[PDB]
Design a binder for these strands. Sequence first.
RNA 1: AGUAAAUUAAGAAUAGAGAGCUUAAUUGAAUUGAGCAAUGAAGUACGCACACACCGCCCGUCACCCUCCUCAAAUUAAAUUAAACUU
Length: 208
Amino acid sequence: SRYAPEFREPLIDKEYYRKPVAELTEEEKYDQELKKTQFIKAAAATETSSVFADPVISKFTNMMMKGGNKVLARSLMAQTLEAVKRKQFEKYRAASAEEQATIERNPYRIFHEALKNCEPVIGLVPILKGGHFYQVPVPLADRRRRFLAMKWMITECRENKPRRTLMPEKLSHELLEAFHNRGPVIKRKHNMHKMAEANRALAHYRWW
RNA sequence: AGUAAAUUAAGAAUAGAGAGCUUAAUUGAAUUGAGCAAUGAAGUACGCACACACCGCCCGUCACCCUCCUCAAAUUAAAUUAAACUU
Ligand SMILES: [Mg+2]
């Protein structure tokens, strides 16, 4: 890295800086005073104070990008969100007043609740004990649990789709199916959890 | 980490000749542990009949030639003795 270890990650929260001084906890108040005598990293090209920037969706975009084609990957995510909004508007208009209440037309809220439905609480680590490969039930961190949900989505759509279907049409159809706990990405989570019960007694081999 | 990946340009050398090489630029990620059971290294302790240094040293059965010794059925071979007393 070209940043020395003494550099601090930038804080790009607009409201945080403009809060009244008394509203800030003394711990936060102390850090701000310390940061005045430190070096701050430059903000990333994609780090902005925009009110429409969601870290979860921005991360999902980077996991789809191939060869640094951010314009294409962002376009694919923009087309997906729109394909989900247009799919719920059609259902909402073609539904009764009672049914209309339940229907969710926010694509950003369908994406977050979809991913969370696919996240697995426990995973598996492959281990070779006595020249035999065993996978031991592991408890997954918040970072490993989130990564696996996004990875499983980007892999079901990339591979298990018809040749002429497009990613905005497969991903939209999968975010909505996961949003209802019916999709194949949810089935992957159910299989992972079910296998952990099979290897329930083999967690002892853990050394880490 | 401006890394990987992807995409460009130029240069060396040639008369010409690389999908090779050198260099410059662009776009631009994911991830980094509740680590040491193992693998390797380092440190400490201990062991060593190894020092060619464990790809070490090393012990028995088995296999030819040669040296010495022992036992043993028998056979024969030479060797080796000592006196006893009568009249
Ligand atoms: Mg040439």
